[PDB]
Amino acid sequence: LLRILKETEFKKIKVLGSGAFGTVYKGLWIPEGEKVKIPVAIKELREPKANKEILDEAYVMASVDNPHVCRLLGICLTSTVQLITQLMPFGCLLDYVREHKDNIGSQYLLNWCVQIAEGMNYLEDRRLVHRDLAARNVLVKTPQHVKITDFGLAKLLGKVPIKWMALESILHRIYTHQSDVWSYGVTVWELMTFGSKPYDGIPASEISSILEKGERLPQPPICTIDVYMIMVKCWMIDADSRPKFRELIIEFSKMARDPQRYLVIQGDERMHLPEDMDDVVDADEYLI
């Protein structure tokens, strides 16, 4: 299922941006021997493991079959490790809610939670942990369908997200699904503050402390107590007490049936949102 690419079988066209370790390019996968050109997004990882191992990990990242968990399509092992995945046209859901603050309504926000949760639940059911789930790691296929990206990358690359990590992770470097729910909670806080930065104004080396003291992210304005409390119930000190993703998917799908009742957005009733040539095949289309 994992396709091994030659540095020739693809070409980085643009630089969509660089995050943690490496940079992301908008490229095109040209399967040697076929006129077809598949739009993809290439990620080149900045160089303590070996190449024979990396492979065994990819084999597993390119095994996650689910509508909300972005799957690995191929890998390119040379002087650098390059990951090939289907190209997501609308960008990270973080940059989305920022440039659309006033235009995103109840129904949508709530759905995304429900989707992201479905993704996290997928991985959970397989005893797989993400570790770096954040608003910046959920791409938008379409404004109505989002999906989690960069799973297993963190495990593959050893600056760590302190604000998104659960306490025990920060203190004892212990990552479990139970921590991922903590990550989720923050991610959800991000969407609710339409992209606002968490604990902004506090220094990472200090988070650990203000957290122990029982201080958590603030209740967004648009969030009716009932919603804020699920997020908050994800940041409990006692991990095994945090909501499992299944519990979330529900508590959250149950609010999407009447969005306006759990989210108070001004002017919700009136809101709306949205290269070619020929031989452009969708990743979907090429990998039957």
């Binding site: 029982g214 958590r216 603030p218 908050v232």
Partner: peptide, 16 residues
Amino acid sequence: MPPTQSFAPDPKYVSS
């Protein structure tokens, strides 16, 4: 909105 909201002395959110 303020950066942090307290939850103490709630034993559930304050470690000891």
